[PDB]
Amino acid sequence: ELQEKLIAVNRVSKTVKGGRIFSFTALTVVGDGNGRVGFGYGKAREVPAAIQKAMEKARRNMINVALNNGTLQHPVKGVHTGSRVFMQPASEGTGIIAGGAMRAVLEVAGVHNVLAKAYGSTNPINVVRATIDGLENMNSPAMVAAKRGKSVEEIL
RNA sequence: AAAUUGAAGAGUUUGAUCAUGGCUCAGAUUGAACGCUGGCGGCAGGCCUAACACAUGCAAGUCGAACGGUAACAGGAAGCAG
């Protein structure tokens, strides 16, 4: 029912004639726990405002994910520029074995049993982007059946 | 019947950013040592260095059913003296 959680809040600076201008960026992630997950990156002069902006962004532009019984559909890799991510379905009771950002994104998405690792850069925004991309691309057996022109029973 | 149920990151370069890239940390372990402290038990372990030098005691004897035998001991026998 739209569970949301803020991964990282980071202070960034701009320089002007006067001096430095600080502002805050908030990376949040929302999801319905049934497949839908979406991340948002808001910027404002103060943290709460930034978070609100991020939340609105995340709530819009969500994406559907094919989940098989609260777990992944197959082992999937994902990249986004520096962040290359691996995530593998695991037996019921394994829990989310996943990094920071990754854990958040998976949890809001609704995966209950995963084995993840973040290779490459572990920059939260890029890592979240990578995970969402991987989750999105991951197809289900009904999808493969549709593509190949067979029944799901012939493929298994 | 069961005996692979298995994979987490963080700090640190920049006014800020992403990347590269090192350093550091979170875990487990030990024939450990040192500091402070210290009640009991169970089960293990205990010269990693000088294969350096070694006082002293012990760590390989046994068989008389292989053999001459009796140093003893322990006993009887024969000779005896009270």
Ligand SMILES: [Mg+2]
């Ligand atoms: Mg030695």
